[PDB]
């Protein structure tokens, strides 16, 4: 399966009580396929509250959204822990249900080493024999990553590229320069059209979830060189996005979801589990303005 | 039971795979008691490689640990983690178990607000009906806690105070002038001296599983006035610790018990698992430096 | 006289004793509007090492670019200081001059309010009468201006608009949102092609004294929508620029000069003075690779 | 003259326009010297809003200061800046007026190397004569130099150790402990006590102005292990200067000063130059509670 174009960071549904809502997490997998018309999905990453969840609980999410999305789509498994033995084990079960590439975010909390970070990707892949595509968030875990190292990182010839979940657009560059056969998928969707003029090679998005129509129209139109009209559409986007991040981003796509008759579900504790009346009314704002 | 004094963060004995060594960890907390002299251990904390394991292991650690200490010391377990039901449900075992106090740091990863991490500390204390210690450690998890928001913390009646591996002793200062009957314990083992000399009530250190002979002289002789003498022990001690860090910290701490007869094994992966030789007999001069 | 497109942040020739050498300072305007074609010159920035030098110093440099340029390109005086005093005598002496626009850092060292940053561009507005550029560089000053702040700013109605040497661009796209009609200079040129799909209105920039022709065609390509080109095109100057940073920024920029009969002199104590013979071999290899 | 003790970080007093009030100037001095009782002052420093100032008019604070002090007390003059030349200038002008040392803030806003760094110390003690204190403030400048760094610095025989306002006290441990004969004054007032210690040889602070009286007594209790004594000053202290810090720094203290009868004038543009009005009754109020 081709990896590359637009992918949706999956939301989780989750019940009162924080269990998994499979018919909730169901109608997100579709909502994605059928009306964002996204290339895939990736499964189990900040987006999906998956550092909140038991290892059972992350292997229920992998089993429904595999189940539900069969082979429509493409499916990454993002399975990085602080814990190398959870992640192997979580990669093991994602690459028997058949996920076509694994990802892992680096090792965080501690100040792991740079040999320490490769000795856990080579790690991961040994043990799963799948691909695997580093997911890079320094602003979350404090982590960054130079060019050289990267290309250390590369050496597997089973690390297919980087999710740039990053803001430094000289390092972007430089990626693409130093490594123009491993790929890129950008991370913040705020920032898409100018990642998209360095020639990333995807987008994987929390936004995309509600925002797939327009992200897919920024990402085509800017290689294809119609910037004027890219702009345009990036503007509305952040008009949009600036909204759910002022209002809670987590819970403000789901109400969003919500609106649109899917049953996205509570945010899981210790996240904020539902959203105030007051911010309700503000996500119903935003959805008249912008997704309506 | 009385938590002031010095507690070591325990350091758990792995083997080569990764499991606990129950034997090695029984030396561990043995040695402790009897020849550090500790006032109680603090069990599942950063040096106990405690965010690398599963839920399961961590619930080993803390069974082991109470079964050899038994009565003898006072026990604080950490039960904190970005996944709150985790926390309850270790904060449970340890209560059941009888540890004295629970401690749980500050939820990481996502940016939590004030109030989700106020719920969070909340719910851990309402679900087990035990204390509770603040972990409080900006330069690994980013979260800066001012007066003002411990003072909303501490309206929760058994919040007993906060381990401070912090480096802001203005903030120190304020806190206890602030909140004078609730408790703090220093975090950081080179700053003991500083640390006891603005009136802290004990100290929570990594390094007391070796030095804990020291580490009791520089605290007691400083709340002494003593403080030429306890100067003198903490600039041995910090020649100790510099070694120590540039060494690596956990796997030099647990050779040091090694060359005194403790079986404390390796370290848990993504940690880097045993020392290079070299650094073996770096350790090896350490030890005959400072500690024989 | 039209304020867009590119404009090289003047380097100036120091002599040995670190006094202006005239001679090199006019050979360097003279080679920037002649062989590198600029639209214009931004004097007095950080590039040209105004903030290593006397009140004197700079109004010699302001008077000599001026005489050698004439009216043939466009000319922006930055003049901002820590001593407001000092850049209003700057700011009127510019004026005086005939500068089409000044310039001025925000004030640094001490941690400033909004309100006295503000108060500090109006006070240089009102004393010389002439329109403003707010010089922003956060990697410098720590000084982060955000989207509301720069509008409290562009209240003033000679405030033109922003020197963006800051590398946030969410930021970028909702300032240019936000007051489509204030002008934004990218001052990051290893980041020109994503600025310039943005939209920004220019660029100024240490490296066009030598790359001018490249900086040129990035920005007019990917106005147009040229992106395939813009960016193989980014690629190569991102190679030069690589090689100039790891060289010695400012030292290695006027060896480049040098090598095509420009006399751009040492540098100006603190900074090292002149480059080693192995930095200057280094420095022919860049030539030789990307500017012959 | 002995350099050890209590030194103020001596303010100016401005007139509306920001020029110098001499008179105001000289009642500061003298207040420090006959009611402060300060073992000496340091002349040019950040407190006294140094880096918004001209040359003429640093000099011209260097006379004054001197002239009124005469050989009362010990004085240091701060003469670091960006500007190398300026620095040598100011340099010798105060060691010819008599000043005991001299001291130079790191260079600044241009990322200097360490070799620069050092070049510029050995500059101005070359073109001087006189003895050098390495001024250290990383939370205005950003640099951080480390223990073998300050070895290689104080390599030249008339470095005489370092005004460390940093708040790394395992730095300041291991400074001590590594260089035991070469000094150190610490730089943070609401700090005093746990700097004290660990056995500084002094204090230069701005709160000194004001409240010298209670600084000796906590750094004298410390030095004679009668630390129950020093906490609750430095208690005291700390309530005084959060409401300072609250109120503006250096506004304040000269507010307390014209409470005291001194005419301390108005802070230098671009700070604010004056208090508000409901600011002016606060600092009454600190007054009042703290030192009266």
């Given at each position: 399966k081709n990896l590359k174009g637009i992918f949706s960071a999956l939301l989780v549904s989750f019940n009162a009580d924080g269990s998994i809502n499979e018919?909730?997490?169901?109608?997100?997998?579709?909502?994605?396929?059928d009306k964002m018309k996204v290339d895939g999905l990736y499964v189990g990453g900040s987006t999906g509250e998956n550092f909140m969840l038991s290892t059972e609980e992350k292997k229920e999410i992998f089993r429904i959204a595999k189940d539900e999305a069969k082979d429509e789509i493409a499916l990454i498994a993002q399975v990085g822990s602080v814990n190398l033995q959870e992640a192997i084990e979580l990669g093991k079960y994602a690459?028997?249900?058949?996920?076509?590439?694994?990802?892992?975010?680096t090792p965080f909390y501690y100040k792991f080493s740079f040999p320490e970070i490769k000795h856990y990707y080579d790690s991961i892949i040994e043990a799963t024999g799948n691909y695997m595509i580093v997911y890079s968030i320094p602003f979350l875990t404090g982590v960054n990553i130079g060019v050289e190292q990267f290309g250390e990182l590369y050496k597997n010839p089973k690390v297919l590229g980087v999710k740039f979940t990053a803001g430094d657009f000289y390092l972007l560059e430089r990626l693409k320069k130093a490594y123009?056969?491993?790929?890129?998928?950008a991370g913040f969707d705020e920032m898409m059209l100018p990642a998209a003029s360095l020639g990333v090679d995807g987008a994987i998005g929390s936004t995309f979830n509600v925002n797939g129509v327009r992200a897919r129209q920024?990402?085509?139109?800017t290689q294809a060189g119609k910037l004027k009209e890219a702009l345009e559409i990036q503007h509305v986007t952040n008009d949009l996005i600036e909204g759910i991040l002022a209002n809670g981003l987590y819970l403000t796509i789901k109400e969003l979801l919500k609106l649109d008759g899917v049953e996205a579900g509570y945010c899981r504790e210790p996240m904020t589990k539902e959203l105030s009346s007051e911010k309700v009314a503000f996500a119903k704002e935003l959805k008249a303005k912008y997704l309506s």
């Open positions: 018919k909730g997490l169901r109608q997100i997998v579709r909502y994605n396929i690459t028997e249900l058949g996920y076509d590439s694994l990802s892992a975010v123009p056969n491993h790929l890129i998928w920024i990402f085509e139109l």
